[PDB]
Amino acid sequence: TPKDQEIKKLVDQNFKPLLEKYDVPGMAVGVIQNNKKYEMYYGLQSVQDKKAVNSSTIFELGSVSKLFTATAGGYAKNKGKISFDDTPGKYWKELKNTPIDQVNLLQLATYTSGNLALQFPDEVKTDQQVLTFFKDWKPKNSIGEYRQYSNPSIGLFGKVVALSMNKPFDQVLEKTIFPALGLKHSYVNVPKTQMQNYAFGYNQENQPIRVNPGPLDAPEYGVKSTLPDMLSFIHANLNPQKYPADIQRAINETHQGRYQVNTMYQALGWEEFSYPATLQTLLDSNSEQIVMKPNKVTAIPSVKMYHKTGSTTGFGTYVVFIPKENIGLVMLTNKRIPNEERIKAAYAVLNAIKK
Numbered sequence: 001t002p003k004d005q006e007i008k009k010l011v012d013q014n015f016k017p018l019l020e021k022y023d024v025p026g027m028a029v030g031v032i033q034n035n036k037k038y039e040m041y042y043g044l045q046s047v048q049d050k051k052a053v054n055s056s057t058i059f060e061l062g063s064v065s066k067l068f069t070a071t072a073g074g075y076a077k078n079k080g081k082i083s084f085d086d087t088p089g090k091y092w093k094e095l096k097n098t099p100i101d102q103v104n105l106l107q108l109a110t111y112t113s114g115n116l117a118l119q120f121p122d123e124v125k126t127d128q129q130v131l132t133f134f135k136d137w138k139p140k141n142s143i144g145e146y147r148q149y150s151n152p153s154i155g156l157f158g159k160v161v162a163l164s165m166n167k168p169f170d171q172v173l174e175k176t177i178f179p180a181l182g183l184k185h186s187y188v189n190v191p192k193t194q195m196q197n198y199a200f201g202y203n204q205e206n207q208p209i210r211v212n213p214g215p216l217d218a219p220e221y222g223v224k225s226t227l228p229d230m231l232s233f234i235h236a237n238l239n240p241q242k243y244p245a246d247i248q249r250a251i252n253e254t255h256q257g258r259y260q261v262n263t264m265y266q267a268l269g270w271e272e273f274s275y276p277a278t279l280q281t282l283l284d285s286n287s288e289q290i291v292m293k294p295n296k297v298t299a300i301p302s303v304k305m306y307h308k309t310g311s312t313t314g315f316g317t318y319v320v321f322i323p324k325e326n327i328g329l330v331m332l333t334n335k336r337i338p339n340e341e342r343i344k345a346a347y348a349v350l351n352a353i354k355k
């Protein structure tokens, strides 16, 4: 179809120069419009092995993994396994009647506990250390009033969701969430038969690097996936009514905005904006003030759009979809590039595609 060549030209125009500007080994860019998928692959999945990026290449999603954690939370909530008004001590019994047991699950998933930073303390490694950290936790800012983007906040949320489903979190995604979304090669732990498809990341000095195990790493940033699976995930977010009710209600749960900070609406995992959104509005969601510092939230849009950036030391990820236009884009790179470049390139592509 002529649309195949129209999308290929737009992605070559906006995303391909990023490979030479930032010395990116490999990249996969996908566009889904009107239920049609368009996949563009560039460069090498592995420099040592000289493998081209293809439809089987597995990328580290980074913070985009939080979208699957939120989907799992919306799945357990609509099945009656959890209520977003419950507290973690109801499911993690060792946290019963502790200060952290005063924060509800929605506040953990939306980073409003009032005293949780971007990362765990460096010395928090083992599972006993993670439990000790939450048992010793004490509140600072008023609970539910300040948003500070936090891995441990949503990591505890995913830990609680796994406990309510009576299965480990890796099985929550790989056995229930991933099959319900129709995903074929998305993993929390990549099996040995898929290591040949697991791309290597590359740091600023072009050395190979792969994400390391960390405290609650799976619900925070430890999901790996391919471009076709991520396009299927965007399709599920673009057309939730075409999926069974259990996963349909889970997707709808992640689309409801819970509060707003300036022009950004914080949904479950996703970042929500009023459509049409200016480029600066999407860029402001990446600013140091929003990402690294606490911000007072404001209580609560008809036309909406959503996006989420994700990164590891050697990978960059960006997903975005517009329900009114029935269009979405996925960017996967095996070298971390500035988030503004990911947003700008996807903004120019989605706006130049014919309706």
Ligand SMILES: *[B]([O])([O])[C]([C]N1[C]=C(C([O])=O)N=N1)[N]C(=O)[C]SC1=NN=C([N])S1
Pocket: 062, 063, 064, 151, 210, 211, 212, 213, 214, 221, 309, 310, 311, 312, 313, 314, 336
């Ligand atoms: B998420 O992407 O927002 C989140 C925060 N983050 C970290 C970085 C980075 O260090 O490049 N960019 N955004 N991502 C993470 O916490 C995972 S970072 C890690 N990379 N390798 C590891 N062993 S941990």
